[PDB]
Design a protein around this nucleic acid. Structure first.
Ligand code: NA
Ligand code: NA
Ligand code: NA
Ligand code: NA
Lengths: 124, 122, 126, 125
DNA sequence: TTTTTT
DNA sequence: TTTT
DNA sequence: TTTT
DNA sequence: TTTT
């Protein structure tokens, strides 16, 4: 979502969009994608949809990553921008580059949540 | 309830007339100035501390004012580079809103020749 | 077309795309457009078509502009990149921003050609 | 005779392994190296003097090698900013070719997830 | 020291 | 963090 | 480890 | 007679 004007860069994380065979949303390399929570997903309450900029679903975040990010999105600790760098025509999974922005005071809370699930932000 | 609509690029202008400074990769705020004596569509660009940096170009403001005034989208601005430019400053804008308003936003932009795209902040 | 590896920025120029009502090609603001000479044009031997990046014709360069640029394009004195900054959905005319690239050995000939037609190059971005 | 197909953005990588320097807004040359023992698709990036600066990222080279080898497009590279970076450098690529080859270029790019767009070398000021 | 703020 |  |  |  839109970040506050005092939002700053927290760091980056690499992950994957999965479930591609079940959706038809098209994305190309170097394009933004949207991360969108789907708490009513009957298979995973932590589900995060990945949509293209026109609104069409591309796939889901891998459930292990969703299990970490769900808390961060739900409590608005950071806004997360997704970009597909390569592999946008892949049949089953594609890489995702995620950039985290947020208020300085929320920086530690984000990093701590990621560490809990075995993730860590990389450099700017 | 807000979803990603896409992005636009533009420039902040009139820098020499204001004292607000910006760092590279910093957010900026867009703020309407409807009583501007030269352009009712004016959109100010302010830095994180609230000091004015400049204005959107009149052609861009001409497209966006309707969108802001009718709350059809929230527009996030960031200056990705060229923050120390003398006359104009690059601006990246990301648009967010309700799906019910996606068409109205694209229609308004289209009147002015703009089309939201998929370019990220970085 | 593609420039030589030793090509440098010459400068910039603002102009206009015309004849929009006669073509169905679509362009949006901040998009590149292609400048394509059309010497076989039965109305103007200096004609320069403007196409979108998919190759669909959008219109033509204004004739007074074409009259200055045709020589530069034909003699390959510079490569010209066009961008439509605003007005891409206008009914009849839209503005065009042009940047000029070329070898330093030709920079003078370009400026003298433009100045011959009352045009001049401005600064290119830093 | 060649027409504009569009542009792509990417990065020059492996800078720290080469000595070639680029300045901002300088053109660079793309040169295939089919004998590279790490990657037959390798595309060198050389500066104006012919000195190697780095390589195209392997995923991008994987898409472009076919296009270069079959002369489906001419690719013009410019470094729009970050020319002084130590590790990786932004690259803007403009594609030109014969109209009859436009679909082949787009098909080859699409197989690798790439799509040419309308972004110029510069948006001006 | 532009496309020269809005 | 940071080739091919 | 074949989406979530 | 407001594209070239
Ligand atoms: Na799919
Ligand atoms: Na100022
Ligand atoms: Na038209
Ligand atoms: Na180096």
């Amino acid at each position: 979502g839109p970040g506050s004007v005092d939002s700053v860069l927290f760091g980056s994380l690499r992950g994957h969009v999965v479930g591609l065979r079940y959706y038809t949303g098209v994305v190309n390399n170097n394009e933004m994608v949207a991360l969108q929570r789907d708490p009513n997903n009957p298979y995973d309450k932590n589900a995060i949809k990945v949509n293209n900029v026109n609104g069409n679903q591309v796939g889901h975040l891998k459930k292990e990553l969703a299990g970490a990010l769900a808390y961060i999105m739900d409590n608005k600790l950071a806004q997360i921008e997704g970009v597909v760098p390569f592999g946008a025509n892949n049949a089953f999974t594609m890489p995702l580059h995620m950039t985290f922005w947020g208020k300085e005071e929320n920086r530690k809370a984000v990093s701590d949540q990621l560490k809990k699930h075995g993730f860590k932000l990389g450099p700017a």
